[PDB]
Structure formats: C-alpha cells, structure tokens
Design an enzyme around this catalytic site. Structure first.
Site, PDB file in Angstrom:
ATOM      1  CG  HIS A  61      -1.754  -1.192   1.394  1.00  0.00           C
ATOM      2  ND1 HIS A  61      -2.822  -1.480   0.578  1.00  0.00           N
ATOM      3  CD2 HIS A  61      -1.690  -2.206   2.300  1.00  0.00           C
ATOM      4  CE1 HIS A  61      -3.379  -2.619   0.957  1.00  0.00           C
ATOM      5  NE2 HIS A  61      -2.706  -3.076   1.999  1.00  0.00           N
ATOM      6  CG  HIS A  91       3.168   5.846   5.767  1.00  0.00           C
ATOM      7  ND1 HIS A  91       2.891   5.757   7.111  1.00  0.00           N
ATOM      8  CD2 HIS A  91       2.086   6.397   5.186  1.00  0.00           C
ATOM      9  CE1 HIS A  91       1.684   6.224   7.341  1.00  0.00           C
ATOM     10  NE2 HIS A  91       1.161   6.623   6.176  1.00  0.00           N
ATOM     11  CG  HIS A  93      -0.506   8.435   1.829  1.00  0.00           C
ATOM     12  ND1 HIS A  93      -1.240   7.275   1.825  1.00  0.00           N
ATOM     13  CD2 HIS A  93      -0.164   8.671   3.114  1.00  0.00           C
ATOM     14  CE1 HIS A  93      -1.376   6.837   3.067  1.00  0.00           C
ATOM     15  NE2 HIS A  93      -0.711   7.666   3.873  1.00  0.00           N
ATOM     16  CD  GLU A 103      -3.762   9.554   2.770  1.00  0.00           C
ATOM     17  OE1 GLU A 103      -3.394   9.511   3.956  1.00  0.00           O
ATOM     18  OE2 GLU A 103      -4.366   8.616   2.223  1.00  0.00           O
ATOM     19  CG  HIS A 116       0.770  10.383   6.829  1.00  0.00           C
ATOM     20  ND1 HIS A 116      -0.239   9.657   6.262  1.00  0.00           N
ATOM     21  CD2 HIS A 116       0.485  11.688   6.635  1.00  0.00           C
ATOM     22  CE1 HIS A 116      -1.130  10.502   5.719  1.00  0.00           C
ATOM     23  NE2 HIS A 116      -0.702  11.732   5.942  1.00  0.00           N
ATOM     24  CB  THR A 195      -5.683   8.137   5.720  1.00  0.00           C
ATOM     25  OG1 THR A 195      -4.364   7.635   5.488  1.00  0.00           O
ATOM     26  CG2 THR A 195      -5.616   9.410   6.583  1.00  0.00           C
ATOM     27  CB  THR A 196      -5.007   2.719   5.050  1.00  0.00           C
ATOM     28  OG1 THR A 196      -4.449   2.152   6.243  1.00  0.00           O
ATOM     29  CG2 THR A 196      -4.027   3.712   4.433  1.00  0.00           C
TER      30      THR A 196
END
Ligand SMILES: NS(=O)(=O)c1ccc(CNC(=O)Cc2ccccc2)cc1
Ligand SMILES: [Zn+2]
Length: 257
Positions: A61, A91, A93, A103, A116, A195-196
C-alpha cells in the site's frame, strides 16, 4: 482485499470497514480561513535526536520506514498532545502526477505527496492497544511539493530499488528523520482517523503548514514502486491516497495566525 484501484479503492472501503463513514474520518480539507487560531496550544516538541531506524518495508500500500519504539528514543510531545508519543514508522502517500497525491488538502489544493510520521501514546503500552483508543495515535503530516531536492530524503529514494514489490524489506539503520522536516513547525490540528483500513478513529492529526520540496527525480522514483508482489502482474504504486472526508462536527485549530 482493499486497495486503491477502481474495484477496491476508497469508495469500496465502507463495505468491510463501516467506520469509513464515521464521525471523525481522515483526511480532510483544511479550510485555512475557517481554522481557528488557538493560543491555548503549546509548541510542538519533536525529539528525534535518539531515533533508531531499523528497516524499510514495501507493504503493498506504501513503504514504511520502521523505528525502534521499545523505549523513548524518538518522541513527539506538546502541541495539542498530553503525554508522550513514540515514533513507530513513517511513510508517504503520492500521486501519478505532481498535481495530486496528498491526502489532506489546503483550501482544496492537492500536494504531490504527503509524509506521515506515525507515533503512539506510551500510556497504552503498545501500538496495537493504542489504535483502540481515541487519543492513541499522533500522526505528523507534512506536505511535499515538487521543486528543489530534499537532501534528507535521498537515502530513502536510493533504497527503493531493493524493495520494489509487496513484501520486500531491507535493512535501513541510522536514518535521521529530522532531515525530512521543514523549517517551521507551525501546524493545524484536528481529531481524525487512520487514512487506510481499518480506518480507526484514534489519531490526533498534526499537519504542518510549511511543505517540504522534493525533486521531480525523487518523486519519480516513488512512482516506480509496485503494489503487486514479485512475479505478479506489474501495477505501479501510485495514487495511494484517500480523498478528503466530510469534516462533520469538528473544528480544525491552528497554532499560528
Ligand atoms: N495513513 S495513516 O498515517 O493514517 C496510517 C494508516 C494505517 C496505519 C497502520 N494500521 C495497521 O496496520 C492496522 C493494525 C491494527 C492493529 C495492530 C496493528 C496494525 C498507520 C498509519
Ligand atoms: Zn499515511
């Protein structure tokens, strides 16, 4: 299982994770003119001098850089937070295009990516316990825009070749996450969620006002990663971001005016 494709992406998540339509979901759009300056907010304390990175992992992911969180070596304190939050991993995004990928958004503006830095509240003992608590996590969110390179990011991008596919990991010691921070620690803060999936409502979000800049070459290297495992059909790991969710009954607070 869940992902970011047409058939398993954010619009599908609620079917296995009903909290997807809950009362404090993340990310959100940060409307700068409606965020309230709060002088009751303490300054942020980022204490990363003793940080011990261990490993970098492609989890299918995103990729995580993991830290030793078995004692107080890299912690976040102050700001809106009470108590001590230990850094467990960071990590990102990111997008397939420079104009999308973050995000959180700022007055509807999307950044090229978002970092993040995930921390958990030490009074809950471990990360697994922490995510079951309304104040279990503190995630420090940092926007990335494309421009000049970020020297402190380069060691991360140079190891991505070794974790191209889902399930690959590589030793990643002695990395200093202080090299990923902007100059200012001015921030917005609001209560939200992972957020996941599992989308648990356990996060105090602290999002920095000042983005960091990364080079086009740096983000292009993010986009060469794979969602799939080795030997499976190649799907580029891009657009692993959850769009903005309804703010509902929340006020975003600002540390600055
Ligand atoms: N994008 S974010 O910063 O909001 C974010 C999202 C997911 C996670 C990871 N959550 C899980 O892996 C599940 C889990 C549950 C109980 C024990 C262990 C793991 C961390 C941070
Ligand atoms: Zn994240």
């Amino acid at each position: 299982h869940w992902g970011y494709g047409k058939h398993n992406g954010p619009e599908h998540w609620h079917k296995d994770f009903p909290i997807a339509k809950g009362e404090r979901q993340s990310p959100v759009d940060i409307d700068t003119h409606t965020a309230k300056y709060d002088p009751s907010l303490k300054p942020l304390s980022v204490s990363y001098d003793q940080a011990t990175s261990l490993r970098i992992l492609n989890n299918g992911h995103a990729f995580n850089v993991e830290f030793d969180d078995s004692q107080d070596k890299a912690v976040l304190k102050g700001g809106p937070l009470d108590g001590t939050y230990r850094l467990i991993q960071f990590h990102f995004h990111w997008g397939s295009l420079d104009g999308q990928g973050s995000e959180h958004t700022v007055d509807k503006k999307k950044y090229a990516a978002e970092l993040h830095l995930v921390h958990w509240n030490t009074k809950y003992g471990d990360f697994g316990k922490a995510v079951q608590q309304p104040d279990g996590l503190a995630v420090l969110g940092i926007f990335l825009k494309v421009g000049s390179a970020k020297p402190g990011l380069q060691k991360v991008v140079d190891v991505l070749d070794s974790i191209k596919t889902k399930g690959k990991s590589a030793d990643f010691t002695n990395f200093d996450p202080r090299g990923l921070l902007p100059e200012s620690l001015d921030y917005w803060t609001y209560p939200g969620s992972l957020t996941t999936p599992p989308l648990l409502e356990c996060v105090t979000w602290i999002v920095l006002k000042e983005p960091i800049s990364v080079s086009s070459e740096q983000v292009l290297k993010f986009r060469k990663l794979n969602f799939n495992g080795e030997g499976e059909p190649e799907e580029l790991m891009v657009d692993n971001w959850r769009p903005a969710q309804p703010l509902k009954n929340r006020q975003i607070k600002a540390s600055f005016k």
